[PDB]
């Protein structure tokens, strides 16, 4: 009956179930949640852990004694429930000081502050046991062309991430960074708008091994991209350090629907890929129960994230294990896709008349790929209609 | 009066002005053009050069004597006009044999053929003087999730590009590759869908220095991305080896409108960036005169590509040179964006109380960015309303 | 096992299974199909009938004796199989003469020709028993703003549809028209781009009762719209005279995937609505088997259209019949949505202090809508995970 | 120098310049503005008037004496400046009670409250001289398919608008309604998502003459539609009762950029159409100065809305008056588009062999439309490059 348990490694941000329902056009529809109560409620649903921005756990501007008490209460909730904290992050987007960015603000003093605020929370993240430190630069970008020279902004972005790498190395921490792309919202265009742009940027950092990506289902879908394809490219690069699961209906504002809502078939192929690849990180949900809901609906929406992942995991495993699917995959030459093109080497390929001079293009063109029969087997498995 | 001359380095594909007007739903509206006549017509408009797919210059399936005569006539047109050939590419998308891809076809024999067809045309490209060899993998991708394992496809894609690098190195050629991303069309999703994905992929090739990107205005806009921002990231990476200029209205089929049509302000900021950065490659137009047009409209549409680039070049230069704009850029702290965040180093930043303990977040938050006044100066310059 | 039979009223266009695979960037991948063979193959799959454009049944430019023989052979196939022809339409988009439109071409002679070509095929449609005559104005529109004055084009569009109404009335035919909106492709923008625009236009025709809409799943999705919502508005207006079923992944070129592919949950809610509303027209598929496929894949893709509709019909019926869903719908106040707001009348509402002066906004705001629990019951029914 | 004066009829909502900068992810960046100060500032810029939601002028929950004082101060500002109030509207979206809608909330008590809150503000609107009463149902819609039966919601929506028509008629008011479509945001899908859907809905009201549309540039662009085309359809229907001007970059969250930003060429063709059609309503700006700005940037952004409209008005008038453009419009057969197709009548068309039997399709197909030369004249006029 698709019941999650902590061994399934499902995690949730405090800001997800704790979202009060404020949007562009609307006031809060739910009261604030104490993080203690969200840890207890999430544990009762079978979650493994929780994640936080600095300012979700400790109100911005807290004194040291207030900070200590917020952390003490949260630690007690973690210890009472067995919940973990595998990931933490910094809020470099809510406060008005970040209206033009944190790490790429035009004001230099704001960039230095953003770094100090991040470093303070990396120390806390390590104390709470986090292995991954996410960075979503939601304010890095522009609404107009003259406001932001992107080459200078990328120079500032590299300096900031290099300084954070130097800091973790200096402290001997075993935490790694996961950069979260998004194409737009709240900025008109956000820097590092997709998984590809973030992977490319990481290759230019001083210590690329310290950084990966934290892709989000709905973010890549806001650019109309195929989320499973982008996760495959991140896995191919060895850079899937964390993932954010939710639902999105295409090219709109970021909806943050529960996982399995939005593009259902993309959710199926995502689960198939994570499970086939043996991804071992948390399955983290960055979602918002809709503001129509009361607290009972918040917990139902959170439970539905995990249930949908487990249903899709069963159907993807049955698809890949079905001998009729295995035969269809060979009929569609998925086995040949996995064989090297020319392990015989360049000169052998140049000398091979079967590759050019004596290649029958028309007989190869006539061979159907059989992809529709394979896809309807996938449909039938997903719908339980075999 | 914005008259282009060959010194402006404007280039056009044979397939652009030569497009006969066939689309998803329509037969040709114009007769085929002899490449000789397109070289002559383009030279008369002030173009610098032309580009080609193999199969635009030599019909697919030509004998050696037919091939020699097509090349001889084209060379004579180039010599009669002074036109150059700075770029060439392979057609790995029209023939039905490429229905599942060239370099990432599931059929191995098709992948080997795609490589041999590419290598034959690299030799011709070098004979005609091309410095850049573009690769647009328009058939690499899928319409369904089971049809294409993307990690295996990227392994095949890397093998293919590595073999092409080994080939050019083996021959001592001074040609470089430019990979052209596109998010979709004709495949439901195309592999390497954006500039970021292509830049990331190149970093994993055996000899990354041989490869850059060939971004196209309309391709990045089909994902709703900011094309000038993506060009800035490619320039930041040192990888803008070629560029395709055209117009697109957002998230649709690839419209291939003349340059300056589609998103006009994005065309302005693109020209501003290419000119500020001192980009020295061809300004290449990959566009289609609409099928409503006769040949006079084809040449008017081609002339309009160049005219719009030259108008936008004048207005962007006037914007950057205007002392009132220079003052607005300082008021918006574009100068501070270009200064290192912490050249004093990590420990100095950690010890700097002005970056945290004594940073007045509210006074920094209250300082307006003045971006709207700067953007209306940019508007006024673009519209000639100063 | 979800086996369709003719009683299910599934229909297919000749151009669907008969699509040879030519696209923007590619030559045909399959040979042409004789309409006789498509009628036989579709009947064997359990289809009810077929539909046609004039030029799919009779090649454009046929002599009268050729026309008679094409019609005779097609009639024999219909009689051999028991297949019906419930709908026909005109091709006013392929021939180059329609490059600027049929009914709204700027050239008046082309508009008059488009009307004569339509009227000739209305007579044939009636002879073959069609009840619905579709009109998809795929060439009505523009790529540039000066090319098409839209108020004048709508005047021409109304004249054309009014003349077609006068013609059918004059002949005593019992056929009705169904106008098919599309937002773009092949024109940069198409006139009557959505269901709403077409419904609005029909209200201004001389005899609106003769006209309804023929919405297509993928067309409304090319504008990012909710297809079930648009079908609900057409049903509310009494104007769903025909429907085109297929799949689409959001905002791209028109993919024409088999029904159930693309947005699966939207396919579920569409079937739920058509079945709840008692829609009695054909379930018509306007799709294209992908060009990767051979003929066996064409028939598998066609069979999959019908199978997916039948699976979704079973799951939507089980959802609506489940007493736990019925209780959830009452908890979410779907029953109250169906009750008049103020059957007591305006003055009673004005005098009702419970509607204003004594309405407790905070107690009403606090009541959760319970929509997430209702939606996860819908998910569980769709996936067979109850 | 493009200086607006009140005779230009530019109007602004209090909520536009008064937007404090709160978004999905961010706190306010500017202090609240007193409506008195916004009226004074807008008048100094040359605006004609202002518009309001009920709750922008009178805080929600005000006592009668507070209400009277807010209205008294606002009236004094209007009288001090000569500013008008041509339009008002109701806020049926911010308060949590409207989380599922106002007029189509599933809770009947909320629907009755939404009507009473609207009617109270219609009385105030009439006292302040408004001729148009806008209704943007931003909360009407859903995030999930079971939550909202759209046929029942449209029944509730018609009841509500019919009751409002009965109310204005009963009071003898000369105010008319303008329904504002939007496709999504804040709801996952909003009911009446485009101009077409709203026009269609109005035709089913009891007294359609009382209702028109209030289209917004950015709303239609959030569906990827052509805003000038949609305004042309509203003008063709006689239903453009008000218009909201702003900028948007395609398919994203609603950006509300100043008018002229976003799609510049669409802004040009919009101004060309409003001015050619002799639209006589207010040119209203529904925009948000970006939250990066301080108050000086708010007023610069507001001034830029008006400046851009006046620049585009000059360039569109010069385009239409240029004898070379007039010749190009005849070469493109825009004159023939405006002539009836068959004023000779149906039987004459049927008997006309020049329309079918003797129509030379190939000679008509060969005639180019000359649209690219016409569009580059439009480009040159817009850019001041003639
Ligand atoms: Co998100
Ligand atoms: Co996230
Ligand atoms: Co293109
Ligand atoms: Co290109
Ligand atoms: Co379609
Ligand atoms: Co269709
Ligand atoms: Co808006
Ligand atoms: Co508005």
Instruction: Look up residue C359 and give its two tokens.
Output: 């309405």
CA distance B113 to A342: 11
Report the alpha-carbon distance of residue D181 to residue D157 in Å, rounded. Answer: 13
- Which residue carries 């900025």 as its tokens? A187
CB atoms within 10 A of CB B189: 24
Closest C-alpha among D221, D229, D226 to residue D246 = D221
Distant-in-sequence, close-in-space partners of D146: CB < 8 Å, separation ≥ 6: C319, C325, C328, C329, C332, C334, C371, C374, C375, C377, C378
Residue D205's φ and ψ, nearest 5 degrees, are: -75, 165
The verdict on whether residue C286 carries a ligand-binding annotation is yes
Of all residues in chain D, the one with the smallest CA distance to B293 is D368
What is the C-alpha radius of gyration for chain C, rounded to an integer number of angstroms?
23
Is A315:A268 a contact under the CB 8 Å cutoff? yes
Is residue B355 reached through a cis peptide bond, with omega within 30 degrees of 0 on the bond before it? no
Cα(D113)–Cα(C349) distance, integer angstroms = 9
Cα angle for residues C265, C266, C267 (degrees, 5° grid): 85
State how far Cα B14 lies from the chain centre: 16
DSSP string, B64-133: HHHHHHHHHHHHHHHHHHT-B--EEE---SSSGGGTT-STT-SSHHHHHHHHHHHHHHHHHHHHTT-SEE
- Beta-sheet pairing, A211-213 with A176-179: parallel
φ, ψ of residue D141 in degrees (nearest 5) = 155, -150
Assign residue C262 a region (left: φ > 0; alpha: ψ between -120 and 50; beta: otherwise).
left
Catalytic residue among A54, A55, A56, A100: A56
- For tokens 């770094």, name the residue: A115
In the sheet that holds A211-213, the strands lie side by side as A211-213, A176-179, A132-135, A87-89, A49-53, A10-13, A283-285, A244-245
Nearest by CB to B224, from A147, A224, A369: name it.
A224
The stretches of chain C forming alpha helices (DSSP H) are 14-17, 35-45, 54-57, 64-81, 108-127, 150-171, 195-202, 217-221, 227-236, 264-277, 295-321, 323-331, 334-337, 346-350, 361-366, 371-383
Q: What is the CA radius of gyration of chain D?
A: 23
d(CA B221, CA D116): 45
Q: Is B292 on the interface with D (CB under 8 A)?
A: yes
Residue of C nearest to B147 (CA): C292
How many Å apart are CA A220 and CA A222, to the nearest integer? 5
Residue with tokens 């060899």: B133
User: What number of C-beta contacts closer than 8 Å exist between C and D?
Assistant: 337
CA distances from A223 to A188, B130, B225, C206 (A): 13, 34, 7, 43
| Triad C53, C56, C58: Cα angle to 5° | 105
How far apart are the CA of B41 and the centre of ligand 3, in A?
23
Give residues 6 to 45 of D whose Cβ lies within 8 Å of B.
29
Closest CA of chain B from D350, distance in Å: 27
- In whole angstroms, give the CA distance from residue A81 to residue B343: 45
β-partners of residue D176 are: D132
Which tokens go with A361? 């293009």
CB spacing of A251 vs D252 below 8 angstroms = yes
Ligand nearest D243 Cα, by number? 8
Q: Quick one: which ligand is closest to D215's CA? A: 8
Contacts of B13 (CB under 8 A, 6+ apart): B50, B51, B52, B53, B56, B284, B285, B286
In degrees, to the nearest 5, what angle opens at C-alpha C52 toward C-alphas C49 and C54? 150
Asked whether B213 and B224 are in contact (CB, 8 A), the reply is no
Separation of alpha carbons C6 and C4, rounded Å: 7
SS3 A176: strand
- Look up tokens 């003898």; give the residue: D172
d(CA A290, CA A271): 23
Q: From A314, which residue of chain C is nearest by alpha-carbon distance?
A: C385
- Give phi and psi for D285, each to the nearest 5: -105, 120
Asked if C379 and A289 come within 8 Å (Cβ–Cβ), the reply is no
- Say if CB C202 and CB C212 are below 8 A apart: yes
Measure A114 CA to nearest chain C CA, in Å: 37
* D244 among annotated binding-site residues: yes
Alpha carbon distance A51, A245 (integer Å): 13
Alpha helices in chain B (DSSP H): 14-17, 35-45, 54-57, 64-81, 108-127, 150-171, 195-202, 217-221, 227-236, 264-277, 295-321, 323-331, 334-337, 346-350, 361-366, 371-383
Q: State whether residue D250 sits within 8 Å of chain B by CB.
A: yes
Cα gap B118→B114, rounded to integer Å: 6
The experimental method is X-ray
Q: Which ligand is nearest to the CA of D222?
A: 7
Q: By the CB < 8 Å criterion, does B295 face chain C?
A: no
Closest by CA position to D241, among listed D287, D199, D286:
D199
One-letter-per-residue 3-state SS of C92-150 = CCCCHHHCCCCCCCCCHHHHHHHHHHHHHHHHHHHHCCCCEEEECCCCCEECCCCCCCH
Rounded CA separation A190/D196 (Å):
32
Q: Alpha-carbon distance B378 to D147, whole Å? A: 47
- Among the partner-chain residues D29, D93, D222, the one whose CB lies closest to the CB of A26 is D93
**Specified resolution (Å):** 1.4
The DSSP symbol for C372 reads: H
Q: What is the distance in angstroms between the CA of the first residue and the CA of the last residue of chain A?
A: 19
How long, in residues, is chain C?
386
Separation of A218 CA from ligand 1 center, angstroms? 6
Catalytic residue list of D: 53, 56
Residue A163: Cβ within 10 Å count: 21
Q: Which of C27, C88, C29 is nearest to C57 (CA)?
A: C88
- The verdict on D313 touching B (C-beta cutoff 8 Å) is no
Please tell me which residue in B48, B54, B55, B56 is annotated as part of the active site.
Answer: B56
Contact between A238 and A209 under an 8 Å Cβ cutoff? The reply is no
Quick check: is A53 catalytic?
Answer: yes
Ligand 1 center to residue D299 CA distance, Å? 32
At the second CATH level, the architecture of A1-386 is Alpha-Beta Barrel (3.20)
D253 touches chain B (CB under 8 A): no
- Asked whether the beta carbons of residue B334 and residue A100 sit closer than 8 angstroms, the reply is no
Nearest CA to C210 among C243, C159, C168, C263? C168
Peptide bond into A252 cis (omega under 30): no
- Distance from C-alpha of A263 to C-alpha of A260, rounded to nearest angstrom: 7
> Residue A168 and residue A209: Cα distance in Å, rounded?
13
**What backbone torsions phi and psi does residue B63 show, to the nearest 5 degrees?**
-75, 170
Q: How far is C56 from chain B (nearest CA, A)?
A: 13
What residues of chain C lie within 8 A of the CB of A294, using their CB? 366-368, 370
Which residue do the tokens 């008679």 mark?
C68
B127 with B179: CB under 8 angstroms?
A: no
Looking up tokens 């908890």, which residue turns up? C331
Q: How far is the CA of A250 from the centre of ligand 6 (A)?
A: 22
Residue C254 assigned to a binding site = yes
Query: SS3 of C310, please?
Result: helix
Widest distance between CA atoms in chain A: 80
Contact residues, chain D, for C137 at CB < 8 Å: none
Q: How far is CA C289 from CA A31, B143, C90, in A?
A: 51, 11, 22
Nearest C-alpha neighbor of D138 from the set A24, B35, A292, B345:
A24
Tokens 């008006």 belong to which residue?
A: D306
How far out from the chain centre does Cα D296 lie? 26
A50 forms beta bridges with A12
- Contact (Cβ atoms closer than 8 angstroms) between residue A375 and residue C297: no
Q: How far is A327 from chain D (nearest CA, A)?
A: 37
Protein residues near ligand 5, an ion, with CB under 5 A: C 218, 254, 256
Q: Give C245-269 as a 3 state SS string.
A: ECECCCCCCCCCECECECCHHHHHH
Chains with ≥3 CB–CB distances under 8 Å to C:
A, B, D
Nearest CA to CA, how far is B21 from chain D (Å)? Answer: 12
> CB distance from A364 to chain C under 8 Å?
no
Active-site entry in A53, A242, A284, A381: A53
Q: Is C186 helix (H, G, I), strand (E, B) or coil?
A: coil
Q: Which ligand is nearest to the CA of D25?
A: 1
Domain ranges for chain B, please list them.
Answer: 1-386
- Are the C-beta atoms of B354 and A169 separated by less than 8 Å? no
Tell me whether strands B244-245 and B211-213 are parallel, antiparallel or unpaired: unpaired
Three-state SS annotation for chain D: CCCCCHHHCEEEEHHHHCCCCCECCECCCCCCCCHHHHHHHHHHHCCCEEEEEHHHHCCCCCCHHHHHHHHHHHHHHHHHHCCECCEEECCCCCCHHHCCCCCCCCCHHHHHHHHHHHHHHHHHHHHCCCCEEEECCCCCEECCCCCCCHHHHHHHHHHHHHHHHHHHHHHCCCCEEEECCCCCCCCCEECCCCHHHHHHHHCCCCCHHHEEECCEHHHHHCCCCCHHHHHHHHHHCCCECCCEECECCCCCCCCCECECECCHHHHHHHHHHHHHHCCCCCEEECCCCCCCCCHHHHHHHHHHHHHHHHHHHHHHHHHHHCHHHHHHHHHCCHHHHCCCCCCCCHHHHHCCHHHCCCCCHHHHHHCCCCHHHHHHHHHHHHHCCC
Instruction: Report yes or no: B167 and B119 within 8 Å, Cβ to Cβ.
Output: yes
Give how far the C-alpha of residue A353 lies from the chain's centroid of Cα atoms, to the nearest Å: 47
What is the C-alpha separation between C177 and A306, in angstroms, rounded?
48
User: CA C224, CA C222: separation in Å to the nearest integer?
Assistant: 5
Collect all residues with Cβ–Cβ distance below 8 Å to A44 and sequence separation of at least 6: none
Tokens of residue D273, six digits: 């159409």
The two structure tokens encoding residue D14: 């209090």
Find the catalytic residue in C56, C100, C263, C272: C56
In chain D, which residues have their Cβ closer than 8 Å to the Cβ of B290? 371-372
C-alpha separations of D384 from A264, B69, B118, D308, D309 in Å: 50, 47, 45, 14, 15
Phi/psi at B120 (nearest 5 deg)? -60, -40
The protein residues having their C-beta less than 5 angstroms from ligand 8 (an ion) are D 216, 244, 286
- Beta-sheet pairing, C132-135 with C49-53: unpaired
> How far, in Å, CA of C245 to CA of A346, rounded?
48
- Written as six digits, the tokens of B68 are 């020699």
Closest approach of A163 to chain D, Cα-based (Å) = 26
Contact C300, A376 (CB under 8 A): yes
C193 Cα distance to chain centroid: 13
Please check whether residue A228 touches B, CB under 8 A.
Answer: yes
Q: How many CB pairs under 8 A join A and C?
A: 124
Helices (H), chain A: 14-17, 35-45, 54-57, 64-81, 108-127, 150-171, 195-202, 217-221, 227-236, 264-277, 295-321, 323-331, 334-337, 346-350, 361-366, 371-383
Question: After which residues does chain C become discontinuous at a C–N distance over 2.5 Å?
Answer: none
Region of B237 (left: φ > 0; alpha: ψ -120 to 50; beta: rest) is alpha
- The dihedral region occupied by B304, where left means phi > 0, alpha psi between -120 and 50, and beta the remainder, is alpha
Q: What angle do CA D333, D335, D341 make, to 5 degrees?
A: 90
Q: Which residue of D has its CA nearest to A188?
A: D255
Among A41, A45, A43, which Cα is nearest to A33's? A41
Contact B218, B247 (CB under 8 A): yes
Q: Which residues of B are annotated as a binding site for Mg(2+)?
A: 180, 216, 219, 244, 254, 256, 286
Beta bridge partners, B68, equal none
Q: Which residues of C touch B95 (CB under 8 A)?
A: 27
D1 Cβ contact partners less than 8 Å away, ≥ 6 residues apart: none
Residue C347: both structure tokens together: 């003055």
Report the C-alpha dihedral over residues B305, B308, B310, B315, rounded to 10 degrees: -160
The size of the B-D interface in CB pairs under 8 A is 124
Task: Confirm or deny that D34 is annotated as ligand binding.
Answer: no
Token reading at C375: 């939606």
Interatomic CA distance for residues C168 and C117, integer angstroms: 14
């Amino acid at each position: 009956n698709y019941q999650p348990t902590p061994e399934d490694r499902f995690t949730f941000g405090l800001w997800t179930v704790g979202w009060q329902g404020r949007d562009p056009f609307g006031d809060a529809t739910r009261r604030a949640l104490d993080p203690v109560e969200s840890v207890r409620r999430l544990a009762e649903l079978g979650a493994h852990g929780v994640t936080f921005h600095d300012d979700d756990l400790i109100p911005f501007g807290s004194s040291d004694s207030e900070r200590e008490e917020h952390v003490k209460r949260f630690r007690q909730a973690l210890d009472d429930t067995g919940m973990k904290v595998p990931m933490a992050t910094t809020n470099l987007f809510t406060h008005p000081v970040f209206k033009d960015g944190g790490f790429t603000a035009n004001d230099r003093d704001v960039r230095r502050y953003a770094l100090r605020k991040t470093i303070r929370n990396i120390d806390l993240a390590v104390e709470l046991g986090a292995e991954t430190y996410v960075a979503w630069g939601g304010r890095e970008g522009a609404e107009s062309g003259g406001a932001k020279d992107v080459r200078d902004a990328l120079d500032r972005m590299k300096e900031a991430f290099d300084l954070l790498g130097e800091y973790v190395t200096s402290q001997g921490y075993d935490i790694r960074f996961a950069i979260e792309p998004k194409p737009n919202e709240p900025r008109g265009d956000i820097l590092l708008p997709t998984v590809g742009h973030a992977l490319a940027f990481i290759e230019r950092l001083e210590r690329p091994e310290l950084y990966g990506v934290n892709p989000e289902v709905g973010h890549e879908q806001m650019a109309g991209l195929n989320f499973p394809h982008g996760i495959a490219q991140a896995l191919w690069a060895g850079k899937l350090f964390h993932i954010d699961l939710n639902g999105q209906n295409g090219i709109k504002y970021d909806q943050d629907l529960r996982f399995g809502a939005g593009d259902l078939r993309a959710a199926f192929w995502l689960v198939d890929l994570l499970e086939s690849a043996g991804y071992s990180g948390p399955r983290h949900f960055d979602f918002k129960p809709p503001r129509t809901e009361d607290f009972d609906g918040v917990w139902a929406s959170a439970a539905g994230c995990m249930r949908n992942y487990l249903i899709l995991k069963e159907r993807a495993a049955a698809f890949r294990a079905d001998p009729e699917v295995q035969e269809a995959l060979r009929a569609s030459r998925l086995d040949e896709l996995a064989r090297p093109t020319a392990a015989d080497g360049l000169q052998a390929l140049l000398d091979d008349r079967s590759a050019f001079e004596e290649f029958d293009v028309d007989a190869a063109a006539a061979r159907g790929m059989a992809f529709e029969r394979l896809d309807q087997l996938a449909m039938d498995h997903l719908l339980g209609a075999r």
